[PDB]
Amino acid sequence: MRVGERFTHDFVVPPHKTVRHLYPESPEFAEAPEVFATGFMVGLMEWACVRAMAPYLEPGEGSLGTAICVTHTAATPPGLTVTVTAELRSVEGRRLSWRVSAHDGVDEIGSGTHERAVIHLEKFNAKVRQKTP
Amino acid sequence: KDGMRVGERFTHDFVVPPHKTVRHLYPESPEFAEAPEVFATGFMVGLMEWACVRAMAPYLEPGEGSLGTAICVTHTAATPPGLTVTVTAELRSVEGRRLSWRVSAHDGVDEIGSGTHERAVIHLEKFNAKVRQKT
């Protein structure tokens, strides 16, 4: 996979990616603004990095987020199209870092960096069960 | 209304269900179908905001709320359903409407990440009047 390579995908924001849907368990979120959650924006960024890496991942392999460092400087109501771009910052060992940015067709809504680590699915799942109550 | 005190440690505890995995963040995503069943980074980000929000709540005036404007954290260990994630949020500084935070999280077994989070106090109503201009 190559330093500088980019991927972009677009996502029309539905009503159910607002703050409050993110944690329906939170009374403290019930009167939150009806805007696209940071946590869902982060997930849309991860999603871009994942698709872009997919064709380079051998069989049985996968990836799990290892860092996220972003701004979220403008809010997006349902119905705007969020465009996300992911650029391969670098690569070291099993780790890839991406520069990620998001705009909603009106404002740039955030940008930053995201790190992921490639994992052997089976191996890693075994561990997780090891950590399950 | 008293103010908030820098350095004050607040804790938020959350027992992770099976519906806060990767796939549950974006059920729209075929590309996530194969993700391990562990607490999603995006949900951890939301848990950390959640923690700061509860803390700052009895300090906000009527009509007021907040918004995460930045986050910068690691996610260094994965958490299956059943474990309790405790978030510790500690206030660093408040400059006008901007509050700044040091956050970390532990699932009872491993520390699963730490870093910083910034939020902006808003008048929820008048903020809606600004976003509406985008809907």
Swiss-Prot record, chain B:
Catalytic reaction(s) noted: fluoroacetyl-CoA + H2O = fluoroacetate + CoA + H(+)
InterPro entries: FlK, FlK-like_dom, HotDog_dom_sf
Enzyme Commission number(s) from the entry: 3.1.2.29
Enzyme class, spelled out: hydrolase
Binding site for CoA: 68, 75-76
Active site: 41, 49, 75
Pfam families xref list: FlK
Domain of life: Bacteria
UniProt keyword list: Hydrolase
Gene Ontology molecular functions: acyl-CoA hydrolase activity; protein homodimerization activity
Residues reported to bind substrate: 39-49, 68, 119
Keyword Lipid metabolism part of the UniProt annotation: no
Subunit structure: Homodimer.
Role noted for this protein: Hydrolyzes fluoroacetyl-CoA before it can react with citrate synthase, and thus confers fluoroacetate resistance. Cannot use acetyl-CoA as substrate.
Protein name: Fluoroacetyl-CoA thioesterase
Organism: Streptantibioticus cattleyicolor
Organism taxonomic ancestry: Bacteria, Bacillati, Actinomycetota, Actinomycetes, Kitasatosporales
